[PDB]
Amino acid sequence: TYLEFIQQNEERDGVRFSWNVWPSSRLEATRMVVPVAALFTPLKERPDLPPIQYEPVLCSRTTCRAVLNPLCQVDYRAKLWACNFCYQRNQFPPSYAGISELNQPAELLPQFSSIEYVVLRGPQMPLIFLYVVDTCMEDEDLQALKESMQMSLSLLPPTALVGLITFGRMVQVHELGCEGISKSYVFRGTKDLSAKQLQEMLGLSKVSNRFLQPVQKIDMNLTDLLGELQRDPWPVPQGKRPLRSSGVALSIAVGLLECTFPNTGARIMMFIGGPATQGPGMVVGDELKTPIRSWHDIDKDNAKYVKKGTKHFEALANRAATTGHVIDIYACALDQTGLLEMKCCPNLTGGYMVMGDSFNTSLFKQTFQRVFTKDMHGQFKMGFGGTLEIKTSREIKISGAIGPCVSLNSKGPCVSENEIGTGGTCQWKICGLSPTTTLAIYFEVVGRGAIQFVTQYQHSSGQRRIRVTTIARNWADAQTQIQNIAASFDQEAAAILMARLAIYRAETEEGPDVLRWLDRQLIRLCQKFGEYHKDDPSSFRFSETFSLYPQFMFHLRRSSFLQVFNNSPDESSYYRHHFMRQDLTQSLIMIQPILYAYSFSGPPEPVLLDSSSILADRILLMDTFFQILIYHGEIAQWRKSGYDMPEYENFRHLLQAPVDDAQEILHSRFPMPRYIDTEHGGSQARFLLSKVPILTDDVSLQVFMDHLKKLAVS
């Protein structure tokens, strides 16, 4: 089955291609509406694999330099192997000498198409966690945030280096381990600073410090300091906002590591409780009379701080990426914090972006601890400073990537001229990644084709490692075997890959022509792979490999990811940040939420995301990735009437049945979603009904297909 080919390749190689059979010519590849592209998750969870304890054998050609893999022919008599990418003849290391057809090395076995090596760099470096704490928040939020920070401190390895920066009207870089007296370095929260300046002013050498010190040495001192921290002392006048210098404190945070520990793994965890009011990075004015930017404000050219503030964090984000450090942003506040301006920091590095109402909620405390999830061996599920290089067969050229990445602008034979997204390169830099981290690579065409994904990352516990993934797909003559190509179509994966593209166009200067282009392709795909007689819309039918794709486009073009004007600018940034970060499975849940139905007549079964599925005798469980909603059908009266009564044992289990699954999702999912319990006529029923020339308006799914049906046949 092709559905088993997809499931077994996503599970084995962490890859999911839009097509598993490629056209043998650039021309016919262009006419296919969805390009040859794949969702690659470089560190996919795989407990079946051993970590191989030696260096990967590499192709001796300098321009190729690929890794030995099962697709490489082997002549055990001559002790040579031929690289399947450039065809170079390659000798073996003398330690392999005893290699034979039956006792071959691991990297050649097809079971190990994806494999991980353990490198021997020689320097084992500790992890660095730099806290950057906002102190302009009620004593509730700060006291809870101190507990979340003391908790994270307990989970870090003993050798890890911790560092504390706090800010408010001022910015303070604290000296740790300085006992008998508490001392800190202070800077005006209104003036920018470079890393060289900060290196001099703090009195540091070039390239443990007094500011970054091991956990085991300073556990007692930092927890005492953490517990003694109190709010920004400077008072806040009426009708005014606190002077919060978030842009400056981060510029000092990035610089503090840039001149002490460059080119190593580190997290700059910035916790903010409100918008930055004292520039640079200034999000909004200090007076409460003016409100924070709205999508209509920034549209009317009426948000005078956006362009200035973003360019600060923009340049700040590139500095951190070029240095090799992660920037997390934990932003809890009853209003916007400026995530739109700061999104580049967790987007270009591998940082997390966590939103919230307040740090004293079950939502935030739980979400923050999931960051520090440990694996089966007590090591964090984090990796740092990753180089993702991609080699392709000489008939394929890389367009570019989309997701948490920064181009290394390393040209080569695999780089295409016309590039897509973060293109013009064969290498990307991912500062912080997790098993879930998922990019979108885009390819171009000009007996199997092959692609290799090599990822060198710094695993926790300071062990340098290299993750190698080598995949192959079949060549096909599209003038003779369209059917063989259309059978390999991955409608699920092709849906995300296009949404991945359509949202990247939404950040660029391009406007609502995205919907216009998004439908131009959808129509093209129906005309090519659709069964129909011309101008007979009713005659048109879908293959079952394609039927779901138009419904995916429907829920995408009407989703939050492209219709921002019902959300805040920070919300839209929160959504897009996670979507271009997720594997296929969770990405699908985002676009088309999953709706389950529970009733006395049968087990829980997924149902259509339409108002027809809303029935009086039915409990619904909706799952968009960011919220979990439970809807009681007009069952609501059975609930309000209290049927606790021992006679109705079953009705007590029907109410409990969807909640029991909801608690399961409320521990597994990393960005722990908002929970909603509502019912028929409830105030919060709004969150369900809403989730239930240009091609069409906000029209139902049936009319969407009808207009699509009659266009594809003409």
Partner: protein, 766 residues
Amino acid sequence: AMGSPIQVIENDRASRGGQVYATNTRGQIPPLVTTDCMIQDQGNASPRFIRCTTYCFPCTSDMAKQAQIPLAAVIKPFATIPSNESPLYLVNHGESGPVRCNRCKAYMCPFMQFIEGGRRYQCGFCNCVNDVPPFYFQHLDHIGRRLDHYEKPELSLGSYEYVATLDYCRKSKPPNPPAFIFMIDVSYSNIKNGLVKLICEELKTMLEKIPKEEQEETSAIRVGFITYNKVLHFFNVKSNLAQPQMMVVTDVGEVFVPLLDGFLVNYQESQSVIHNLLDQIPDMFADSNENETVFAPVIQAGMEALKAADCPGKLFIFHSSLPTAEAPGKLKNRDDKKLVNTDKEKILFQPQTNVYDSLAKDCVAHGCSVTLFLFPSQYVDVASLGLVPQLTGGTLYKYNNFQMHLDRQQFLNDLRNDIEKKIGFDAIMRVRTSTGFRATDFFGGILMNNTTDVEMAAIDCDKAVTVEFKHDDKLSEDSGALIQCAVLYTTISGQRRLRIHNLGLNCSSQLADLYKSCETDALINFFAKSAFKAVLHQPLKVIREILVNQTAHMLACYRKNCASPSAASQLILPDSMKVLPVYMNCLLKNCVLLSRPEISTDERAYQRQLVMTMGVADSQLFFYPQLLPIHTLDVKSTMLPAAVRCSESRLSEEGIFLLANGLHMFLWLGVSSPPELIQGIFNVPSFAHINTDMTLLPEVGNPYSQQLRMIMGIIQQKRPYSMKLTIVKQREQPEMVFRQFLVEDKGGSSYVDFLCCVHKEICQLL
């Protein structure tokens, strides 16, 4: 054969010491500053507060230009009134504030003639007529004297105090009590020479002695703390702390204060937290290897802290060496000889950067005063460092080549003194005169933006301002010349207050009365500050010529207009100016006006600033030292020994002497000194058994050592700076430094040289 300075001082002491000087007469001439006498105010301001160069003004402008006698007053407005003399009263005139002339704006004083049944008073200064306000009215007697003339001190006394209503305050709001901020230089220099521990260790004890009035139980002055070594270390010492915090500021280009609360706190509340800080700071920087420091930012910060607290204050800076670190106020080593015959010498006595003037203006605008304890060992540019302490009205203490085993006691005594000093803050002095003349020039540790208001950030009991008058219109020999010095200021308890000084002076068209009413000690005071201030603008050969020619022009005018006819071979001097040639000749011998050989530019700049703040009692001594014979000293029956002329001719190889001028105190020992005395004072057998380098106080000999210790104590009594003792063996010793204080010797030209020099140009006028 001229009357020596000693002969004049002891003469006036004989005919005026131990007598009550009652200031009840207009043109009354007070005794010399060198005559210990009791003083009763009786209507005129005491000569301890204000003295004049002439207590009888010339009535017209041309008459003053004839005599060329500078008309000036030396106002020491908070001078220490002795315990046995009547103190000032504080007058409260209700919500209205003190009664003032509507046009003259002079305060109600005994110079106000009440007329018309007491309903109106005529002003004594501008002869304007005012309506007596209803709450202050009283009938008048046959004379007119108000019934309460002797009851209300503002109507009977020359010196008293007023309560200042809110319209006399910044922002029209009751000011806040001041704050002391202690800022310690912690470069390797002050670490090594053990300075840091001492200040800190010694500081714990000293804070207790912070000034406070009798009416309050705890001092209202708050205390702040700072350390630095090219970087600023602020400190948080809030009361609710177990351990003091530190906040280090590195942006020296744009300094700021990182705190408001926990900085400037009440000592008695934060006592344990402060002692915990002072215990640590020695260890904290014990291993600092930093030499470069900053300076102007330190003043920049302590001033900013005071503005942030909306309060006046005083900065206690303890500094070590030349500030070189790249920052505002960065001073270079610029000691290059262009002093004589250059026309540009004025540069050396001026600060290098332009910021120290602006910085000083900012401190005075916010009531911030800087006092500086400098511990140099090399060039420092006293012209630059001390400019802000001078303009802010603060003091400057320089300890050349500090060594702990010697200069410790000297520094601690200067430091205890400056804390307990009776201080007023955010002060502005205004000197109103009667009709015919006005104050036109001011000299002192002051700053002035207009031409009438004399702004003093802080002012103590030792400060003194010299004020010059010029002629506006013709005065009246009937009414004479009036003076009213008013000092508005804020006290150490935060109250707004006016201290008033009234002085009447006589007028006459007869030049005889003008010369008959002159004071030399005050005339010398003016000429020094006039010449010292002119150092900044004109070559020194110009300044010395002006002083000489004005002296001869004063004496010739007396010769050609007053003296009964005498022979041409005689120089004729008035009794008021018997010693004026001696003293004037010593001013021209002083290193401020002398030449490069063997004297640092720092030493010239230090003395140039010291004199600028002096009262007449101090300016007299600094220019003519006191030379006391100790060998001939009576034993156990001792007042102060009689003084002896300042010359090597009055020393004996068998003698022991004590030279002091207010800042240094020398003990001189002849080669044939009686070994009996050397044993009873130094506890060593012979003369050759002493060490000059061991100038610490000796103590053992009961018979004399106590007699020598006793006379040193009474010399030091009235002296604000505690003097650096320096012991001199007679021959081939550090006597060269000593000989410069023998001011009647040659060294420039001697005394008899300048007399003969005066008499040539007194006849050149012909």
